[PDB]
Design a protein around this ligand. Structure first.
Ligand SMILES: Nc1ncnc2c1ncn2[C@@H]1O[C@H](COP(=O)(O)OP(=O)(O)O)[C@@H](O)[C@H]1O
Ligand SMILES: Nc1ncnc2c1ncn2[C@@H]1O[C@H](COP(=O)(O)OP(=O)(O)O)[C@@H](O)[C@H]1O
Ligand SMILES: Nc1ncnc2c1ncn2[C@@H]1O[C@H](COP(=O)(O)OP(=O)(O)O)[C@@H](O)[C@H]1O
Ligand SMILES: [Mg+2]
Ligand SMILES: [Mg+2]
Ligand SMILES: [Mg+2]
Lengths: 49, 445, 450, 443
């Protein structure tokens, strides 16, 4: 019904441009997730104590 | 003479026409899908073409072979020499999209044949099965084709064909204000939020001890959602017949107590309301009613499919006092009966892409606790509906148990389980002499 | 050989003979079979038409055996044409037990579905290969309607889901028919207790009333008074299931109550002329009417109750009241290991009955003796422990308290109050009635407010 | 006469020439040497060889590909080959015909062998008996060897051992990375597990609100981007249009709520576009929003995927109770046993893991500890005996609201076939349905 590039351009109407992900791939994203999770764990521990 | 019909010629014509024309691809993409073709190499070709028209758009002959190399599939689908002929042919200009139209048509046909074959199979091989669980198979498997502009029958699906529908669900919103709702509107602004609106695939349970207004509540919901929409609804009633139902719903609307209806002591200013709510129920013809005695879930599904066959996929259902629902097959034991029910209901809600409201009851062992705010353990039906469900909204109208309370004219909701969101607690009022809840623009909570 | 025995559509023929052999041999079962089988569920045309007659007569002309059937079958010109009389005799000759029918009608429905699905699959496939230049839109709606016609062949014509407008027409016609005549506050059945109709609007016609109490409050008397009154206040039947005690006591009590004389002047014989006058009057008023019907049974099930009631409904008129007494005796044996589920079953089934006929159902009960250790003793919704399903199904509950049992110093003598404890349409309240039980009847109480 | 059927023959060949799904359901039962005649044997050979790669075998693909081997007007040719397509529209039961074909074929073969035994018995031709009977043995055992389902049988120690040395060989030079199979990212969890082993039943099970469907989505969501190899999801609990919103939200670290409303900022839209486009150049995942299943149906879909391309690497079934095989729905324990055995079969078959979610019975509420164990699930331990791993969940802050453990989900491993028991701590944040590691104090 609608394919990838057209799907992406379709969703792009909802946003402004110059919004790029700057992620480009997967393992980098997982690294970023690891970092954010370990950030959060600390404040979580604070609130517990 | 008797063949599954495929147009291999026109298919390849489409392919080679897309090769030397990377522009006229979205228009074709409105019609053709990878599952729509017949052999495998054409599918590999098409899906790679689409994956590349995402990023690498100018592609005629060779970039496809390069990408096909980058995952290492050369010679698995013919090869470069094979592709040369696919390139040379189809010099067409005028007619491409008609070929796509007819090929999609052929796929619908082929699908119908395969389904008919599965039906006959399960006929010869019932596999320890009743007729009731067999007609339903057949009916559902046909109706799933009759519906569904896209999204062919049972079986898994790739991702892009799902992201289409999901981005459509997101994009339908921004054509209008968000309104808080992502589903159906209840008419209660206190409740749209913590529910995010009734999501239209889910089983709901509206449980309470007997005299708390749960039936009145669900009647109010289906009522309001009759007039914030233009679709059908149903009212199954294992508890009382169409007359009391009509009176109560009518009076919930026109705001005159039932005592001034069945009697006839009513005034002009009341008839003023009645004529209007009447003429506004008649000029829509949404509601349908089912005043049965003893139902099975099979019958429920049957009636639903017919009413959806008439016009539109329906938008809301109500079922009354679920503990009366029987199937004689498992009359020996009751727990598995409840389980099979809840299964059927959930699959229905997921079939027609609708919500369901299925009332219930609670075992009274919450009497002797002296707090009496219900929670998700007092209901004792194996917990087989503490699991299947998606939204559970108990009720506690305090001025039934206590008498001299400051909490009169109130019936607060309690939410126990939400599959897609949080829980909470909500406040509403009750004036049972004409049977309708109302919002509570009151203190903090 | 057997390979060519696979292309045959599945069928049974011995069951098909045996069913009709039993029905022609016995008419008591037509309910069950017609609740499992339809004309087309058979294989061929003769047995189909036979079943057609064996249902269409029992609509109105009940008897259907061998010759009372043929005497109708002839008038449509079908003797010696659907097998004929000589062959038809075979069905009545063999299998003379009528030992099992229901099983021999399940499998027919099974094979019938299994066959009417396959005859559809082939007829879809052949057209899917012979498209006739059709188009999908003109090709799939036929398949929809085809598959759905299967289930439509079974469904009774008047049990489906109604539209709003027809229901609404019924409602406005009801209100119209009311305004053609006085209202009295009543919306159905009357009782005789004007104090009661206001909080109740009469006994409504599609409900499950309950009347619970301790042993000696007198619930039984109250239910008898209700049916007794609704006899003379109607031109329509009633029933009673006196599972407690048999007819020869019930009618003494009822007669006596109607005539304001104590029982102990009847079975003794020390009575006046005024007495016998008031006796003969109520007698000759009961017997010129022929409303009531009684059943001094012993132990029962809802499955038999429905049959005994529907026999009455199909014989003549539609009933308008029922009473059931001391519910606990109603056995449903599969559950007798337990009791909670038993009561749930009974309540469920009686509700379904009453709605299947659009009539009221009085039904009595008992209360567990927990309240005694409270020193208030006015019963409430929490002291009846019978699964508490009766606390859910019922559209009405009306307990009974009467101080002059517990206490004896009473300022409240000869007075029985009615503690309503639930309602599905009206509101709750409390009623104050008087008791004079040497002839077993309750009465109104024109008195102070409460 | 030798017994041999001809109606079953024509029907089978026409049906496979009509419905190209059935090649599995036939070929499981039937062998090319079962037909009494040779042309149809050629035809069946062609069918199997094409369905190896080319699915469409009806008339025209079959005729045109068979043309190249120069075999027309030799099996009855075009018009007879079409006469197959003339009759038999419904393909009523391809299965039973295909059963009796094999039946009579085996009977005929064995009777032939017996006849040859007798004739060589009365006609020795300078033969011993001891050196003879090896031919009787081998002649009789040739039957099933003509049937052998693609070279399955009792392997020898050297082949097995070389498979193992090949494992260590491929594994050693590349970085050890801890993993011994499939990954999850949780570097605290890979230690007690060493990876979801490639051929194992895994089960996940905790009470409703403890959020386990989330955990399974997390596993597939990670293992996709760590691989370039497929997965599956069977959502018997909710349709895809919620699944993808949830998973997208999990990756992009933004709540479900803002999406379905739309009050989110460019900081979020960037992460959305990233995870979107990064899924949409891989096409790993495959979803099914079905409702009612049988394990056979499941096997069919899965094998379809694996035959279309390559081999899968994961499965995630959801809310296993709804999986029926209706023959036994009068009973429960036998039912669950059947699903367990069937999934184990599938799993060992394709050399895949399985992740089959479950539920627990509420009895544990009456225990005052509420840390589940192997007993609280009451299915005669049918899945318990069958697992190759189990790991429960327990999020404290449901029950004891005042507890000093907020968004701290532990993972109680209650059975493990290869490794030992253990315990893990993890953190739950249901705003976007995702677990994270716990770089905090001990456990
Ligand atoms: N938007 C949200 N905000 C807060 N909590 C949420 C939200 N969405 C989901 N949750 C929580 O996540 C949990 C996930 O439950 P789920 O994954 O369905 O497990 P199960 O399938 O066993 O019910 C829910 O119990 C819910 O409390
Ligand atoms: N006309 C009325 N006057 C006063 N109260 C009423 C009236 N109609 C209904 N109610 C009250 O509203 C409540 C609604 O109960 P109901 O809707 O029957 O819930 P359920 O079906 O679960 O019993 C009743 O408990 C009753 O007291
Ligand atoms: N002939 C009588 N004379 C005096 N009192 C009577 C007579 N018959 C009954 N009673 C009183 O009236 C009550 C009748 O109620 P009853 O029929 O016993 O109700 P239940 O069936 O609930 O026991 C008796 O319990 C008794 O106290
Ligand atoms: Mg109700
Ligand atoms: Mg009595
Ligand atoms: Mg789940």
């Amino acid at each position: 019904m609608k394919n990838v590039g057209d799907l992406m351009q379709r969703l792009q109407k909802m946003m402004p441009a110059h919004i790029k992900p700057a992620f480009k791939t997967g393992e980098e994203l997982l690294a970023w997730q690891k970092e954010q999770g370990a950030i959060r764990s600390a404040a979580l521990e604070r609130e517990n104590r | 003479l008797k063949v599954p019909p495929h147009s291999i010629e026109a298919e390849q014509s489409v392919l080679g026409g897309l090769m030397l024309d990377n522009e006229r691809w979205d228009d074709v993409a409105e019609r053709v899908v990878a599952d729509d073709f017949y052999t495998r190499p054409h599918r590999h070709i098409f899906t790679e073409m689409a994956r590349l028209q995402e990023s690498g758009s100018p592609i005629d002959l060779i970039t496809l072979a390069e990408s096909l190399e980058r995952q290492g599939q050369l010679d698995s689908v013919g090869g470069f020499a094979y592709l040369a002929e696919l390139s040379k042919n189809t010099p067409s200009a005028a007619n491409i999209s008609a070929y796509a139209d007819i090929v999609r048509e052929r796929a619908v046909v082929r699908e119908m044949i395969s389904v008919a074959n599965e039906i006959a199979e399960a006929g010869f091989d019932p596999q320890g099965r009743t007729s009731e669980d067999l007609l339903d198979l057949a009916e559902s498997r046909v109706f799933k084709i009759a519906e569904s502009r896209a999204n062919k029958d049972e079986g898994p699906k790739n991702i892009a064909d799902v992201l289409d529908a999901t981005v459509a669900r997101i994009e339908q919103l921004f054509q209008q204000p968000h309104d808080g709702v992502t589903g159906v509107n209840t008419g209660y602004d206190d409740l749209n939020k913590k529910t995010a609106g009734l999501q239209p695939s889910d089983l709901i349970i509206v449980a309470a001890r007997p005299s708390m207004g749960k039936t009145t509540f669900a009647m109010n919901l289906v009522e309001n959602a009759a007039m914030l929409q233009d679709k059908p609804v149903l009212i199954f009633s294992l508890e009382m017949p169409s007359e009391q139902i009509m009176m109560r719903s009518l009076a919930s609307l026109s705001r005159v107590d039932q005592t001034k209806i069945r009697t006839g002591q009513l005034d002009d200013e009341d008839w003023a309301r009645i004529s209007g709510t009447m003429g506004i129920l008649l000029e829509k013809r949404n509601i349908y009613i089912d005043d049965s005695s003893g139902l099975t879930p099979t019958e429920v599904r049957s009636r639903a499919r017919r009413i959806a066959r008439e016009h539109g996929g329906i938008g809301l259902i109500m079922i009354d006092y679920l503990q009366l629902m029987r199937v004689p097959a498992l009359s020996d034991n009751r727990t598995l009966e409840i389980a099979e029910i809840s299964r059927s209901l959930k699959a229905l809600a997921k079939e027609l892409n609708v919500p369901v409201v299925a009332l219930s009851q609670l075992n009274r062992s919450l009497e002797q606790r002296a707090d009496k705010r219900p929670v998700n353990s007092d209901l004792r039906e194996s917990g087989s509906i503490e699991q299947d469900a998606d939204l559970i909204m108990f009720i506690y109208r305090d001025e039934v148990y206590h008498e001299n309370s400051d909490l009169k004219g109130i019936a607060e909701i309690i939410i126990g389980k939400q599959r897609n969101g949080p829980i909470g607690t909500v406040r509403l009022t009750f004036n049972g002499q004409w049977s309708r809840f109302d919002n509570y623009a009151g203190p903090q909570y």
